[PDB]
Amino acid sequence: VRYSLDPENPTKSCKSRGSNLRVHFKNTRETAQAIKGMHIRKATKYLKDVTLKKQCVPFRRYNGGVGRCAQAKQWGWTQGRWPKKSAEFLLHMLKNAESNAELKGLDVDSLVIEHIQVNKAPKMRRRTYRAHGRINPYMSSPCHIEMILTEKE
Amino acid sequence: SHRKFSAPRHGSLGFLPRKRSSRHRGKVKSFPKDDPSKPVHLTAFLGYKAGMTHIVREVDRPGSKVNKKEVVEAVTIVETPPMVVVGIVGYVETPRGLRTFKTVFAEHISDECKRRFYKNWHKSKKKAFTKYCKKWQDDAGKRQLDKDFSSMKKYCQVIRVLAHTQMRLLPLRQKKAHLMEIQVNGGTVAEKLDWARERLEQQVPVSQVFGQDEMIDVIGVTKGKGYKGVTSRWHTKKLPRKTHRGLRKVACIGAWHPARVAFSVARAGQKGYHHRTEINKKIYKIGQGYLIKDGKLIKNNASTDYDLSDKSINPLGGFVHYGEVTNDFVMLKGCVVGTKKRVLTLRKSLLVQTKRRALEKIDLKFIDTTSKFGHGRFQTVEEKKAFMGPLKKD
Amino acid sequence: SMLRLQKRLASSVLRCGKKKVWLDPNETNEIANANSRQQIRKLIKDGL
Amino acid sequence: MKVELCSFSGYKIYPGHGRRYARTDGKVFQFLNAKCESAFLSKRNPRQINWTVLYRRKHKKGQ
RNA sequence: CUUGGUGGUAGUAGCAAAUAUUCAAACGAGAACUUUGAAGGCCGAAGUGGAGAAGGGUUCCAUGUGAACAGCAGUUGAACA
RNA sequence: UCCCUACCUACUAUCCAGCGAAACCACAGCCAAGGGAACGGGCUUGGCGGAAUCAGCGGGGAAAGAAGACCCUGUUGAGCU
RNA sequence: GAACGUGAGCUGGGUUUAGACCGUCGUGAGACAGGUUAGUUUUACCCUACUGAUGAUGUGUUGUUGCCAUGGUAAUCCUGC
Ligand SMILES: [Mg+2]
Ligand SMILES: [Mg+2]
Ligand SMILES: [Mg+2]
Ligand SMILES: [Mg+2]
Ligand SMILES: [Mg+2]
Ligand SMILES: [Mg+2]
Ligand SMILES: [Mg+2]
Ligand SMILES: [Mg+2]
Ligand SMILES: [Mg+2]
Ligand SMILES: [Mg+2]
Ligand SMILES: [Mg+2]
Ligand SMILES: [Mg+2]
Ligand SMILES: [Mg+2]
Ligand SMILES: [Mg+2]
Ligand SMILES: [Mg+2]
Ligand SMILES: [Mg+2]
Ligand SMILES: [Mg+2]
Ligand SMILES: [Mg+2]
Ligand SMILES: [Mg+2]
Ligand SMILES: [Mg+2]
Ligand SMILES: [Mg+2]
Ligand SMILES: [Mg+2]
Ligand SMILES: [Mg+2]
Ligand SMILES: [Mg+2]
Ligand SMILES: [Mg+2]
Ligand SMILES: [Mg+2]
Ligand SMILES: [Mg+2]
Ligand SMILES: [Mg+2]
Ligand SMILES: [Mg+2]
């Protein structure tokens, strides 16, 4: 289907996407920036380090209230967190991403992740009860993911 | 409107950047202006704060009511083992300031001092001052050195010396040595230089530097106490019980139409770990440490002229949070800034101290060695053994 | 797997609280296939 | 420095510590610590208490 | 102003009433919360017990399910079939 | 209770994983005097000015709150005498 | 003196609601710069401000020991011989 950015050489690349994912939008954007240029083998390790609070993610745009941590200094920033949930999802997405490449006939250990992009999705809603008989909304913020691999040694 | 009942203000505005110091060791901000009358001598020294104890002495001050009486007086122990000279550095005087002209290190530098120039020692290869020490094993290197010294003969006015501590001997955990600059206040620059050139790479004890019944200025960092509210920091009045939203506060800050809040008003923050300067601390006694003679070592430091008993200043069960005091020390009157194991920078007085009190002569009668770890009731162990007797375990 | 039903019946048979019933943890799969009161009376006589 | 003795315990008091108590009748007493002080005010007879000297003295211990 | 939609404020305020959980094993893709056993605690017969009325109206029981709900999760449930 | 404050304990606040609001919002947000609807965040003239951010704090924003209930006007009313 | 400084800093005794007692006035409903007693004191997580805390540009990278242009500023008074 029509992706936003067309790859330069289809022979080299493979596509993959994922729709309507119950995750926080704001977490997934910044974690998605740090990985953007990296190697696939570095990242699948890297994300596992996040699960153990070993390597942080620097929070740049969506930075309101976020506490400081020491590991961010590698990136050149103070604020960082170890957002587990967002890691576990787009690790399923790489495996699904890699297998699909195998059908097209490529070497896995040359694949550089060239592009990634998040979009907001249709909000769900439940409610919470408050004082003096008032009922505010209590809304989810789910997100659309998509990504494009390119071979680069 | 006017305040009804006038009252003096809490605190001082002249200290009020109440902030955590970048530095941990106290900088000697300004040394004295040297004078030829005296021969050359060193202005400053580096000690460590061990603990506290009692003293007893007959005092002689005609005119006072306490004339011919045996008072007691509290004293600190500052362990000041000898420091090692490893360098000089010149300082030209300008209308802008006092620019550093040319530093000259020695050939051989110890590993305690080398430790300072690296963050991670285990990792590093320890390659410091290798290519430099070549200048001390060639004709050309010493030749440029001679040019350096001749320049410093001409143009440089002031000379400071780089003297590091011998931390290896101490019981502490850190092995990393403290370097430090020490200004020389003496005669002419040539003399001052040939003396330091003579003493380069040499030991320096304290008996050389300081003497007894001298007033000195103690510098050091305060014992930090963390976050404390404005009450404990600035010492305001507590509010009464009926308050809704708390009472350990200052209620009105400032007025309306000076629409800002002034800097003088007391707020909350960090207390302590402020750099500080106590003055007029009299040196009652420089006690000599442990040293071996005739096979056996002689360690009876606290034996005085009147008691003539063998005990040392080391109390029962060691000084708390320190170790065994083997090296030389000083016994200052009163408290001083800083906690245990804390470095304490001693300095000679800027002002010419000449009063009836400052010229007073000390004659100690007794040094208390009883335990600090609870209500001690025994000076020494043999006295204990006599009072108690033989135990079951023996 | 899921044995709250069997504990409940055991209590109704013995006419006591299920607080007192002791089951053998080892023969779990053997208990799970009970689903019936006479078959439990059989397990009682059996002694598990 | 008259190293005064403790009235209660029988220990030798050294100069800086301890706390003297001068009553209205006279009879200046010395005490090493509040432990002795509290027993003194509650009027417990020291000859019964083990750690004191008078106990081991009464029962002829040592020598 | 009317209806409908979307922002900053914010991934913040917050999920603090009445003492408490811990070890192993099983199914299962996955378990701080499921189940069993073991150990430690509480309600302490004016009860956090056993039975009824008015009132609710299939919520009772079993098997299976794991979309949505149970303000975290759940192999569970008064949810669904 | 006060001279006169100090120390200790539990629940929080704090940091983290998960989940996640609303009031409010013309633009925005460093000061002195000056004149001006006679007390300016913006104007004039002066003083100056350095990314992004954390925990606190209550001087200001004539802060939010509720088309002023006291007063007056109204050829607008009700309750009572 | 500074919005007769200072209430999202307190208190709420008095003024200044609703309940009630008295004297005088008014036939009465009611009145009194005439007395008396009981009577819900809201929100901060915004911007700035101050306080303290990470950090930022430039010298190719990195430590080291050091320099001071600027701000701040402190001591007081009394008794006896
Ligand atoms: Mg923001
Ligand atoms: Mg905050
Ligand atoms: Mg609620
Ligand atoms: Mg006055
Ligand atoms: Mg109150
Ligand atoms: Mg002590
Ligand atoms: Mg918070
Ligand atoms: Mg939080
Ligand atoms: Mg609650
Ligand atoms: Mg509780
Ligand atoms: Mg109870
Ligand atoms: Mg029942
Ligand atoms: Mg049922
Ligand atoms: Mg859960
Ligand atoms: Mg969390
Ligand atoms: Mg304005
Ligand atoms: Mg304000
Ligand atoms: Mg206001
Ligand atoms: Mg109105
Ligand atoms: Mg109106
Ligand atoms: Mg009208
Ligand atoms: Mg008219
Ligand atoms: Mg009418
Ligand atoms: Mg006013
Ligand atoms: Mg108020
Ligand atoms: Mg106010
Ligand atoms: Mg009144
Ligand atoms: Mg009448
Ligand atoms: Mg100045």
Q: Quote the DSSP letter at residue A18.
A: E
Reduced to 3 states, what is the DSSP secondary structure of residue B115? helix
Contact B273, B21 (CB under 8 A): yes
Which method resolved this structure?
Answer: cryo-EM
AA letter at B378: F
CB of B374 less than 8 A from some CB of D: no
CB of B389 less than 8 A from some CB of D: yes
Spacing, Cα A134 to ligand 20 middle (Å): 29
Check whether residue B98 has its CB closer than 7 Å to nucleic acid strand G.
Answer: yes
The CA–CA distances, whole Å, from B182 to A62, B104, B147 equal 52, 15, 24
The CA–CA distances, whole Å, from B227 to A74, B18, B268, B269 equal 30, 11, 8, 6
In whole angstroms, give the CA distance from residue D7 to residue A98. Answer: 91
Check whether residue B246 has its CB closer than 7 Å to nucleic acid strand G.
Answer: no
Residue of D nearest to B69 (CA): D1
CB of D60 less than 8 A from some CB of B: no
Reduced to 3 states, what is the DSSP secondary structure of residue B286? strand
Q: Quote the DSSP letter at residue D15.
A: T
Resolution in A: 4.1
In whole angstroms, give the CA distance from residue B150 to residue B187. Answer: 18
- Which nucleotides of strand E lie within 7 A of protein CB? 6-7, 9-13, 25-27, 34-38, 61-63, 68-71, 76
Among residues B36, B74, B353, B25, the alpha carbon closest in space to that of B217 is found at: B353
Cβ separation B368–D11 shorter than 8 A = no
Tokens 């505005």, residue located? B13
CB of D26 less than 8 A from some CB of B: no
The CA–CA distances, whole Å, from B376 to B77, B373, D14, D16 equal 19, 7, 10, 12
How do beta strands B83-91 and B158-164 pair? antiparallel
Quick check: do B and D touch, 3+ CB pairs under 8 A?
A: yes
Determine the distance between C33 (CA) and E60 (C1') in angstroms. Answer: 23
In whole angstroms, give the CA distance from residue D7 to residue C40. Answer: 83
Task: Please give the backbone phi and psi of residue A14, each rounded to the nearest 5 degrees, phi first.
Answer: -140, 155
Cβ neighbours of residue A41 closer than 8 Å, sequence gap 6 or more:
A109
Token pair for B99: 């620019």
CB of D27 less than 8 A from some CB of B: no
Residue nearest to nucleotide G48 (CA to C1'): B260
Determine the distance between A35 (CA) and E7 (C1') in angstroms. Answer: 29
Cβ separation B368–D14 shorter than 8 A = yes
Among residues B26, B45, B54, B25, the alpha carbon closest in space to that of B334 is found at: B54
In whole angstroms, give the CA distance from residue D14 to residue D3. Answer: 6
Reduced to 3 states, what is the DSSP secondary structure of residue A50? helix
Reduced to 3 states, what is the DSSP secondary structure of residue C40? helix
Write out the residues surrounding ion ligand 4, Cβ under 5 A: B 2
CA quadruple B171, B175, B178, B179: dihedral sign: positive
Token pair for B330: 């000083």
Compute chain A's Rg from CA coordinates: 18
Determine the distance between B9 (CA) and G78 (C1') in angstroms. Answer: 21
Among residues B142, B40, B31, B154, the alpha carbon closest in space to that of B90 is found at: B154
Check whether residue B295 has its CB closer than 7 Å to nucleic acid strand G.
Answer: no
Q: Quote the DSSP letter at residue B20.
A: -
Token pair for A110: 């040359």
